[PDB]
Amino acid sequence: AKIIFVVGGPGSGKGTQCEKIVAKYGYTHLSSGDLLRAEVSSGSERGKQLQAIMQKGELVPLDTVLDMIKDAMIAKADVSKGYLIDGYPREVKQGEEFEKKIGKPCLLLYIDAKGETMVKRLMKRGETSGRADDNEETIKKRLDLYYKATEPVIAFYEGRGIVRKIDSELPVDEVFKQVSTAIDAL
Ligand SMILES: Nc1ncnc2c1ncn2[C@@H]1O[C@H](COP(=O)(O)OP(=O)(O)OP(=O)(O)OP(=O)(O)OP(=O)(O)OC[C@H]2O[C@@H](n3cnc4c(N)ncnc43)[C@H](O)[C@@H]2O)[C@@H](O)[C@H]1O
């Protein structure tokens, strides 16, 4: 099965575009954030540790996140012709371990938004839906961690030759036209 990585800053639009891909193309959307949140909601001790980390806007350890992604991919293996890995990898080492333990991606959709745009989007969502990490201080930390840890992922996969940059400043449907062009070109 094809493995597509979807990487971009917090609030850039990764989840939105992934849900569009699912509806049009039928790939399996796995979200690292949603997996981690599902553990938090289980009430486990592990979930309590993850909630603490996520609330602070820091990165969860690679071992826990990659486990859960692998767990989810195995659970869907029967029925998936492709996977969208949304929000993983977030550092170069995550990408390398994923390739060692699972397989190589065929495409990286780089969901590119401006920093100010991301702040605005996450503040709006936080005011609405109240996700715990959508508060101003945590937003700032998430964005700074993205620039520091995650942009080198984009460089790594530029070196591999598989990055397609998606202008996520446009309206949702215009972003998805770019996304669709990239996927149709595989
Ligand atoms: N691999 C990893 N390693 C270690 N730790 C990890 C990890 N993965 C996760 N974690 C941990 O878990 C935390 C959460 O990670 P995760 O949940 O993956 O959150 P994120 O990167 O913080 O993503 P969001 O879901 O905040 O953004 P999105 O880019 O999907 O934007 P969306 O489409 O929702 O859109 C945002 C909003 O904007 C709107 N919007 C989208 N596109 C547009 C558009 N084109 N125009 C106008 N509005 C738009 C949406 O409607 C919505 O309101 C991390 O901070 C970390 O602690």
Author numbering: 8 to 193
Authors' own words:
AK is a small enzyme that catalyzes a reversible phosphoryl transfer reaction between ATP/AMP and two ADPs. The structures comprised the characteristic three-domain arrangement: the CORE (residues 1–38, 69–136, and 143–193), AMPbind (residues 39–68), and LID (residues 137–142) domains. The static CORE domain provides substrate-binding sites, and the dynamic AMPbind and LID domains close over the AMP and ATP sites, respectively, upon substrate binding. AK is a small protein that undergoes relatively large conformational changes upon substrate binding and product release, and has long been used as a model system for studying connections between structure, function, and dynamics.
To confirm that thermal stabilization caused by the Val-to-Ile mutations resulted from the optimized hydrophobic CORE packing, we determined the crystal structure of a V28I/V118I/V173I mutant of AKNc. The Tm value of the V28I/V118I/V173I mutant was 11.3 °C higher than that of the WT AKNc, and was identical to that of AKDr, the most thermally stable homologue of the three tropical AKs. The overall tertiary structure of the mutant was essentially identical to that of the WT. In the mutant structure, the conformations of the residues neighboring the mutated Ile28 residue were almost indistinguishable from those around Val28 in the WT AKNc structure. This allows the added terminal methyl group (Cδ1) of the Ile28 side chain to interact hydrophobically with other residues in the CORE domain—such as Val13, Cys25, Leu91, Leu116, Val186, and Ile190—indicating the enhancement of the hydrophobic packing by the V28I mutation. The conformation of Ile118 was essentially identical to that of Val118 in the WT structure, with the exception of the extra methyl group (Cδ1) in its side chain, which makes additional hydrophobic contacts with Val13, Gln24, Leu116, and Val186 in β1, α1, β4, and α9, respectively, in the mutant structure. In contrast, the side chain conformation of the mutated Ile173 residue was distinct from that of Val173 in WT AKNc. The χ1 dihedral angle along the bond between the Cα and Cβ atoms of Ile173 was rotated ~120° relative to that of Val173 in the WT AKNc structure. The flipped side chain of Ile173 interacts hydrophobically with residues in β4, β5, and α9, including Leu116, Arg171, Val182, Val186, and Ala189. It seems that the improvement in hydrophobic CORE packing by the Val-to-Ile mutations increased the structural stability at high temperatures and decreased the catalytic activity at low temperatures.
